[PDB]
């Protein structure tokens, strides 16, 4: 063949922490289809918003927004348990079909994004060069987000285990845990990845009695 219909940029969705997660890679030949199962980032979430992105930047806000839609009717469950299957499907028409499906409630929502959406040829090259020019900063952000998300799970799991523990946890330790939790929460708001890591370790340090109780 002398030519191919290909994606000139990555297509994906925004995920926890404000990152773009890619579903169809840059330079994928069409037709193509890809599905992936995701879950929730907190306990009892009843709906999710699927924010569709085009581009090459790691921070979702720096990509081109193609659309969004909701999937509601998610049964309340602990975080990470619901199964939300997100499908990107682009056939020869160059129309992007995005669906999200709750594999338990069976509820599904879909949208279509026409061939003309997203960046034009000039904006496509600028986006590729902006990605290049900011590669440094983009990778730091990706690593910081992975660390943030890991700290967030630890914070929230520790808080659950304190609840289940009740008066079984010594007042002394309960107070020391609560302190470390607050410090980690503070470190999470910042941009210093090592500081989050030290606060994760410091919280696990004071949790020994808590972990035995569980």
């Amino acid at each position: 063949v002398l030519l191919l219909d290909v994606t000139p940029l990555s297509l994906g969705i925004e995920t926890m922490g404000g990152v773009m997660t890619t579903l169809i890679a840059k330079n994928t030949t069409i037709p193509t289809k890809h599905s992936q199962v995701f879950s929730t980032a907190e306990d009892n979430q009843s709906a999710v918003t699927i924010h569709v992105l085009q581009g090459e930047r790691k921070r979702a806000a720096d990509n081109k927004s193609l659309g969004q839609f909701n999937l509601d009717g998610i049964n309340p469950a602990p975080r990470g348990m619901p199964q939300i299957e997100v499908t990107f499907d682009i056939d020869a028409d160059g129309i992007l079909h995005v669906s999200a499906k709750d594999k338990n409630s069976g509820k599904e929502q879909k949208i279509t994004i026409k061939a003309s959406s997203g960046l034009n040829e000039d904006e496509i090259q600028k986006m590729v060069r902006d990605a290049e020019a900011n590669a440094e900063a983009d990778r730091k952000f990706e690593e910081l987000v992975q660390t943030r998300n890991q700290g967030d799970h630890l914070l929230h799991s520790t808080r659950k285990q304190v609840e289940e523990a009740g008066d079984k946890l010594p007042a002394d330790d309960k107070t020391a845990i609560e302190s470390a939790l607050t410090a980690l929460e503070t470190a999470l708001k910042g941009e210093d990845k090592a500081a989050i890591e030290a606060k994760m370790q410091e919280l696990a340090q004071v949790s020994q009695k808590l972990m035995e109780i569980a």
Partner: peptide, 8 residues
Amino acid sequence: RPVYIPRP
């Protein structure tokens, strides 16, 4: 590494 969608 499992991934999660944010709360709306």
